[model samples]
Target: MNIFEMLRIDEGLRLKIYKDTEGYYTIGIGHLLTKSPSLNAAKSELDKAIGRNTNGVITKDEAEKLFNQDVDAAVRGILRNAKLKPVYDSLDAVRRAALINMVFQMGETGVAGFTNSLRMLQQKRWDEAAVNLAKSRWYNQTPNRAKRVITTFRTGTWDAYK
Candidate 1:
């Protein structure tokens, strides 16, 4: 299957922002609503289009389309960040995926706020970067998830994450 097809299949469509298995407010093909400006903007546009305020409802096709657009915007966000791009490009696919995942969870600006981590990553100091990552509020919020990311950086493998 092509990339688009795979992505679409992987992230099933949602008609409304319901709590997922993890209890996060999510909708529109896995779009997380936690501090997500995208969710707010999408809700505004949907409300405008329908000529009324919506409870975050979107059609299946709209979800697919929105998912694609959101993914594109996220990739562009990573690429557009001057400090992030170089370090991002230097990593292999697995590590790159981890970074993009972080960007997706925390917006580009949020991820970019990890100044020390980014500096370590840019310097190819994987251990230092891993340490720095574990020292953040993000890690404290989700220790297991943080450990998986830290493991990948330190070992250059996705095994622990998988």
Candidate 2:
């Protein structure tokens, strides 16, 4: 299946800014607020990735493309993090994917803050990992999404969130 379909199943299609897990404004399949140093940087990323303009909203196709770009960036960030790499590499694809999804929801730096959950995953304690996720500050911050991630962590299935 296409990566867009996978992300659509997980993130849902949204063309507007909605408050995300940490309460930062998010939009277009989970793009966190982009307060930039320059419109050039924003233009380069958003326009090329999703056709977003300084003018206004993006289309669904643009959102999907942006989703791919965003997920790719998140995956790369997760892969590059020394502390997160082992935890990512140690899991089955489904579990690894779930973690990647987590990195998307909470940026790499944000996910890095999940020490207890990271420890549980590192130890391969899937149930405990799920529990740690469920009991997190993030969980309280965004219950519905957290429930889905916790399910994915517990079940090791990509569709658990859907």
Candidate 3:
């Protein structure tokens, strides 16, 4: 199944309702932490997820609403904004999906923050686009996640599956 399905959006509608648990459970495209869950762990998971998603543009607060705040609200906010969709659409399906994942995790503020990289994307410099992506703090913050994304885009394989 596509990652979006894995995240739980059904027919473009969010299904991950809120719950009181260890933190949150993102069945599809949303996360929901309890009112007083582990903030640090929540942030860490958010970071990892965001970094994995947009190739690393998302951040904690932006993603909070996706997972922590409210699923329905998050979907509405994203659909209303073109910033994420524009970049995602420019890429191949896999690449686009990856960017979505990142966008879901980080948010426009974090994802769109890459001004130079966006320019490279606009120029269609695939190699340089990837290179510029690797230059972000997200690259360093989530190395394994970043590596997997880069490998997937460069090789189209799920696990560095050589």
Candidate 4:
């Protein structure tokens, strides 16, 4: 399968945000994720989650515990990628939600870390942009989800993310 195929946006994903011990609101694949909340519940959860942007700070051990293998990998991916940083830095809250969701699935390291891929975006080279995206470490990681998000990013018609 192609790289683009990996990132299919999970449009209906419930993102319930809850406050940790430090009063920071955060979200992840958890009880809500496993429980599969309704759209409204998810929205409420995300509202709380979105508000809890403490710049990677988590107060509870449970919050840290939630960072399983995939979550840990995804967080690492986001922290290390400079190019993706600019885009990520500029994204609105909702856009950030979608982007993070994509990264969560892809793992931040490859999707955001690739120098050439980021350079492609900085240089405004669309073809190379796509190629660089495919070259990402997460390319082989989650082929379907990657493809879906890249396709959305390319066309500018994708939203309502997971």
The C-alpha lDDT values of all candidates are 0.70, 0.71, 0.51, 0.48
Best by lDDT: 2
Candidate 2 lDDT over 7-62, as tens digits, reads 56656766765555445445688776555544345445555455445433577877
Question: Which residue pairs in candidate 2 have backbone atoms (N, alpha carbon, C) closer than 3 angstroms, thus clashing?
Answer: none
lDDT tens string, model 3, 96-149?
545555555556567767777766665667677778788877778666666656
Off by over 4 Å in 1: 1-15, 19-25, 33-65
- After superposition, the stretches of candidate 3 with alpha carbons farther than 4 Å from their true spots are 5-79, 155-162
- Candidate 2 error regions (>4 Å): 1-6, 16-23, 35-54
RMSD to the true structure for each prediction, in A, is 5.0, 3.7, 11.0, 12.3
Judging by TM-score against the true structure, name the best candidate.
Answer: 2
Q: State which candidate, 3 or 4, has the greater TM-score.
A: 3
Worst 10 residues of 4 by lDDT: 1-10
